[PDB]
Structure 1
Amino acid sequence: VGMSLLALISIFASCYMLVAARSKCLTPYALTPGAAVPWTLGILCCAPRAHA
């Protein structure tokens, strides 16, 4: 039980870190009326799939 709990905590922490990194790297582009840089779009998937 302890091992499973530790593994779940670690994987959730890592997933949260990935999500936070994506959101923080992608946020400045939603504060401009500009483009999304398809090069970064492909690697960093975002909610707007085709719009803007």
Structure 2
Amino acid sequence: VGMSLLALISIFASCYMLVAARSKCLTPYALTPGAAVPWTLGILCCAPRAHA
């Protein structure tokens, strides 16, 4: 149980911190009426799949 719980903590923390990195990298583009730079979009997926 201890090893399993530590493994779950590791995986959740890592995935959450990737999500935070995603939002921080993509945050300035949601404050301008600009393009998403498909080079960034393809590597880094976002909620807007096609719009904006």
Moved over 3 A (4+): none
User: Kindly, what percent of the aligned residue pairs are identical?
Assistant: 100
* TM-score normalised according to structure 1 size: 0.98
* TM-score normalised according to structure 2 size: 0.98
Count of aligned pairs between the two proteins:
52
Separation of aligned partners in 2, 1:48 and 1:12: 24
- In the alignment, structure 2 segments of 5+ residues that lack a partner are none
What CA RMSD, in Å, does the superposition of the two structures yield over aligned residues? 0.3
- In the alignment, structure 1 segments of 5+ residues that lack a partner are none
